[PDB]
Design an enzyme around this catalytic site. Structure first.
Site, PDB file in Angstrom:
ATOM      1  N   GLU A 184      -3.057  13.618   0.313  1.00 52.86           N
ATOM      2  CA  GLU A 184      -4.375  13.239   0.835  1.00 52.86           C
ATOM      3  C   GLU A 184      -5.178  14.453   1.302  1.00 52.86           C
ATOM      4  OE1 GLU A 184      -3.615   9.652   3.540  1.00 52.86           O
ATOM      5  OE2 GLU A 184      -4.721   9.088   1.755  1.00 52.86           O
ATOM      6  N   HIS A 193       0.822  -1.263   0.000  1.00 53.09           N
ATOM      7  CA  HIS A 193       0.000   0.000   0.000  1.00 53.09           C
ATOM      8  C   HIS A 193       0.820   1.260   0.000  1.00 53.09           C
ATOM      9  CE1 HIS A 193      -3.269  -2.795   1.004  1.00 53.09           C
ATOM     10  NE2 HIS A 193      -2.590  -3.112   2.098  1.00 53.09           N
ATOM     11  N   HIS A 251       5.360   6.959   6.395  1.00 52.26           N
ATOM     12  CA  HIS A 251       5.099   6.454   5.030  1.00 52.26           C
ATOM     13  C   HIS A 251       4.588   7.607   4.186  1.00 52.26           C
ATOM     14  CE1 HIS A 251       1.245   6.300   7.130  1.00 52.26           C
ATOM     15  NE2 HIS A 251       0.796   6.793   5.977  1.00 52.26           N
ATOM     16  N   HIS A 297       3.383  11.000   6.146  1.00 50.19           N
ATOM     17  CA  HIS A 297       2.803  10.846   7.477  1.00 50.19           C
ATOM     18  C   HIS A 297       3.752  10.183   8.450  1.00 50.19           C
ATOM     19  CE1 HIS A 297      -1.401  10.740   5.345  1.00 50.19           C
ATOM     20  NE2 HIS A 297      -0.955  11.982   5.581  1.00 50.19           N
ATOM     21  N   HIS A 321       2.134   9.061   0.571  1.00 45.99           N
ATOM     22  CA  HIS A 321       1.008   8.902  -0.418  1.00 45.99           C
ATOM     23  C   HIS A 321       1.314   9.801  -1.568  1.00 45.99           C
ATOM     24  CE1 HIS A 321      -1.567   7.093   2.802  1.00 45.99           C
ATOM     25  NE2 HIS A 321      -0.922   7.945   3.570  1.00 45.99           N
ATOM     26  N   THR A 375      -6.412   7.272   7.310  1.00 45.72           N
ATOM     27  CA  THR A 375      -6.929   7.420   5.959  1.00 45.72           C
ATOM     28  C   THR A 375      -6.906   6.099   5.174  1.00 45.72           C
ATOM     29  OG1 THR A 375      -4.739   7.918   5.081  1.00 45.72           O
ATOM     30  CG2 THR A 375      -6.067   9.824   5.827  1.00 45.72           C
TER      31      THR A 375
HETATM   32  N1  LIG Z   1      -2.395   7.028   6.540  1.00 47.28           N
HETATM   33  S1  LIG Z   1      -2.475   7.305   8.082  1.00 47.28           S
HETATM   34  O1  LIG Z   1      -3.854   7.808   8.486  1.00 47.28           O
HETATM   35  O2  LIG Z   1      -1.297   8.181   8.533  1.00 47.28           O
HETATM   36  C1  LIG Z   1      -2.247   5.735   8.969  1.00 47.28           C
HETATM   37  C2  LIG Z   1      -1.844   4.678   8.141  1.00 47.28           C
HETATM   38  C3  LIG Z   1      -1.559   3.422   8.803  1.00 47.28           C
HETATM   39  C4  LIG Z   1      -1.494   3.342  10.195  1.00 47.28           C
HETATM   40  C5  LIG Z   1      -1.153   2.105  10.965  1.00 47.28           C
HETATM   41  O3  LIG Z   1      -0.855   1.155  10.241  1.00 47.28           O
HETATM   42  C6  LIG Z   1      -1.237   2.143  12.491  1.00 47.28           C
HETATM   43  S2  LIG Z   1      -0.729   0.488  13.210  1.00 47.28           S
HETATM   44  C7  LIG Z   1      -2.226  -0.385  12.857  1.00 47.28           C
HETATM   45  N2  LIG Z   1      -3.327   0.233  12.316  1.00 47.28           N
HETATM   46  C8  LIG Z   1      -4.487  -0.443  12.137  1.00 47.28           C
HETATM   47  C9  LIG Z   1      -4.579  -1.776  12.462  1.00 47.28           C
HETATM   48  C10 LIG Z   1      -3.443  -2.392  12.993  1.00 47.28           C
HETATM   49  N3  LIG Z   1      -2.273  -1.718  13.172  1.00 47.28           N
HETATM   50  C11 LIG Z   1      -1.885   4.411  10.967  1.00 47.28           C
HETATM   51  C12 LIG Z   1      -2.227   5.679  10.371  1.00 47.28           C
HETATM   52 CL1  LIG Z   1      -2.606   6.960  11.339  1.00 47.28          CL
HETATM   53 ZN   LIG Z   2      -0.887   7.915   5.605  1.00 48.88          ZN
END
Ligand SMILES: NS(=O)(=O)c1ccc(C(=O)CSc2ncccn2)cc1Cl
Ligand SMILES: [Zn+2]
Ligand SMILES: NS(=O)(=O)c1ccc(C(=O)CSc2ncccn2)cc1Cl
Ligand SMILES: [Zn+2]
Lengths: 261, 261
Positions: free
Chosen positions: B102, B64, B89, B115, B91, B196
């Protein structure tokens, strides 16, 4: 029972309406990277749009917008089949945020948007049948901005208090529907997309005119406050506001313009 | 398996991930009508961002995005709890439409967005456990536009070729993550929202810096073209492009700013 707000709002429509999660979705953001001039997009002609003021046409609140039924003798000339009218309706925002068009241009919403829905009458008996078939529908979209009072849009809005609730019907004397189109209808954007409401069928040829029309702040407030999604006797009323879908990914599609610059 | 394109794209995330159709969804358009200065919004302090150059941090392609693991002694000071880093990471869009942030600002996308994900370590032992809990997460978002070459982003971008395909990994020597932040980090947007990506839990406190950073055109094209969503042996490869969510409705709510002027 889909809505634009809450659990049954647009990120959930694909749970009951698979095409809402599929390809070719509308609306979209019209921006330079995806526009390409096409000199073969010649002018459309609007035939039978000057509806008799001695005849009357049914206006209905269908729980999602307000729609005016249109006669099948009204049609567009200039596409590759005749598309005959079936209905027009609108999308809009709310009194505190009058920014409820569906299409955006370079990232900006207009106040509201008018769709005049046509179906391919050369091939299909009615719009309902056309709706799930290849290039079955063609919509003319007019972007609406806050500006001057518009007498022609008022021939629809002056009836809103008689269709406040879902299922109500009123009759509107005929008027010339071409008066709802903007200046220089020869300049438009064209693309292949979908219904912007469930069941989000990818069967629409979109024409979005380049130039907006204006209606006044008072006319927008009337449209944004007159109507309910729910029936007269519903103990959980819901205002019909913010009845526009967010723009969709344009996944590999181009939008073709009949204007170069 | 969730994706950003085709049957399993964003309109379809809410079937398996119900919070994708719930409240407080991000990202959002940051526009003037919904901004309100809040003098309460003081500068964050970035503590333990200068990663030991004698430690290595795991860079992955998870199908992703490209993600860099971060150590839990790196944290934000200034919030109601300490929020410890877990990963960063990005986007982005694609070379034909290189506008893949985003968040948008006054309806405009930036080229990309970084982010830096943190979790409430005062309350929870790790980011996985915090992700679905009250006050669980805090993300710093940096908007990225094309301009000057940026040596600090190259400290991550120079390893992209090692993580082309899903499941691949590489090690990045520690460097000062604060170099990835823009100028005048005191100036930011703040609001409560959600991940997101699936599972879209509404448990993130967003901080989007007001000022963008620059990377060169060549760095931006590298990020857009270096990676795939699929495993190396997959006979139907899919490029990793357009990995951002469309903006969500945001009505009767404010975004607070640390800046008025
Ligand atoms: N795009 S974003 O909103 O900055 C975002 C993307 C991925 C993750 C995580 O992977 C947090 S760890 C996790 N999340 C959900 C389920 C199990 N582990 C967290 C955030 Cl805040
Ligand atoms: Zn993100
Ligand atoms: N907002 S929009 O995209 O202009 C749009 C909205 C509603 C309808 C219809 O209801 C056409 S009739 C029908 N459609 C699908 C299934 C059974 N009947 C058609 C269009 Cl093009
Ligand atoms: Zn419509």
């Amino acid at each position: 029972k889909w809505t634009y707000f809450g659990p049954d709002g647009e990120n959930s429509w694909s749970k009951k309406y698979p095409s809402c999660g599929g390809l070719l979705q509308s609306p979209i953001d019209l921006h330079s990277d995806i526009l390409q001039y096409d000199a073969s997009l010649t002018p459309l002609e609007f035939q039978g749009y000057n509806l008799s003021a001695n005849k009357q046409f049914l206006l209905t609140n269908n729980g999602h917008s307000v729609k005016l039924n249109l006669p099948s003798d009204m049609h567009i000339q200039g596409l590759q089949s005749r598309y005959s009218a079936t209905q027009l309706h609108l999308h809009w925002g709310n009194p505190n945020d009058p920014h409820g068009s569906e299409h955006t241009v370079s990232g900006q919403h207009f106040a509201a948007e008018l769709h005049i829905v046509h179906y391919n009458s050369d091939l299909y008996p009615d719009a309902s049948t056309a709706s799930n078939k290849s290039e079955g529908l063609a919509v003319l979209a007019v972007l609406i901005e806050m500006g001057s009072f518009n007498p022609s849009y008022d021939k629809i809005f002056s009836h809103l208090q008689h269709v406040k609730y879902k299922g109500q019907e009123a009759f509107v004397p005929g008027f010339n529907i071409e008066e709802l189109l903007p200046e220089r209808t020869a300049e438009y954007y064209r693309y292949r997309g979908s219904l912007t409401t469930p069941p989000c069928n990818p069967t629409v040829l979109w024409t979005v005119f380049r130039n907006p029309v204006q209606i006044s702040q008072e006319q927008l407030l009337a449209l944004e406050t007159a109507l309910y999604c729910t029936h007269m006797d519903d103990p959980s009323p819901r205002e019909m506001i913010n009845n526009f879908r967010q723009v969709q990914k344009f996944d590999e599609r181009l939008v073709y313009t009949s204007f170069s610059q």
